[PDB]
């Protein structure tokens, strides 16, 4: 039938993970959102023609390496790694959540989006050219998003769904 396409936001504490998922799919900008409050969002959308159901896992809670947890972790298809424009340390951690994907799926070929969030700020700290730097040494897309205004964050979800399609060809 439908496609589903099962996409895993992870990412730094305050990087806005639950801000991009919750604008994407309930349609408004959360101010402040529990950091320990993990669900799975879902919505059919449009995407390039194709009705397609997306099914979103906003990460959350603490750090840890259960069988089950790497398990749940496999299944995602593709991931957005996110960090913050204003927060140097979620850009320096990006290495950190690329390897544990690496690890579950056992790939260098896992579908992927590098966003840096909170783009509507000034007084950013991540130089632009910085990430397209890091985007470019993976062969990963680099999108800067605004969970407040939205910008961006329609394309960035999107852009992993067209990964994930090419990775199935
Ligand atoms: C504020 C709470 C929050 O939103 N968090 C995001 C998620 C839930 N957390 C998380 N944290 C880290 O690393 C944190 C940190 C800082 C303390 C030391 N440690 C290492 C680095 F320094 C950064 N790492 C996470 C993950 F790697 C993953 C994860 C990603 C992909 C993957 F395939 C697997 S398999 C598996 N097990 C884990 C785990 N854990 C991952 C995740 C995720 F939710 F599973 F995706 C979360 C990670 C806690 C805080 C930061
Ligand atoms: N100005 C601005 N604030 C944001 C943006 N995204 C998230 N926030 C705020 O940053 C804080 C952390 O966001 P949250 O989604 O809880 O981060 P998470 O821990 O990664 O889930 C919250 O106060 C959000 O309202 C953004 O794009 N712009
Ligand atoms: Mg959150």
């Known amino acids: 039938g439908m496609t589903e396409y099962k996409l895993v936001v992870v990412g730094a504490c305050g990087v806005g993970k639950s ?6 799919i309930q349609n408004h ?3 402040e959102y529990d950091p ?16 397609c159901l997306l099914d979103i896992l906003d990460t959350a809670g603490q750090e840890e390496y259960s069988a089950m947890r790497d398990q749940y972790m496999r299944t995602g298809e ?18 950190h959540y690329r390897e544990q994907i690496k690890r579950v799926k056992d790939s260098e070929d896992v579908p992927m989006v590098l966003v ?9 700290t991540v130089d632009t050219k910085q990430a397209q730097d890091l985007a470019r040494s993976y062969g990963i897309p ?9 910008q961006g964050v329609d394309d960035a979800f999107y852009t992993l769904v067209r990964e994930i399609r090419k990775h199935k060809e």
């Open 19 to 24: 801000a991009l998922t919750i604008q994407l």
């Open 29 to 31: 900008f959360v101010d």
């Open 36 to 51: 320990t409050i993990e669900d799975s969002y879902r919505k059919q959308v449009v995407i390039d023609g194709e009705t």
């Open 78 to 95: 593709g991931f957005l790694c996110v960090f913050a424009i204003n927060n140097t340390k979620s850009f320096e951690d990006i290495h």
């Open 116 to 124: 840096g969030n909170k783009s509507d700020l000034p007084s950013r």
């Open 142 to 150: 680099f999108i800067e998003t605004s969970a407040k205004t939205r």
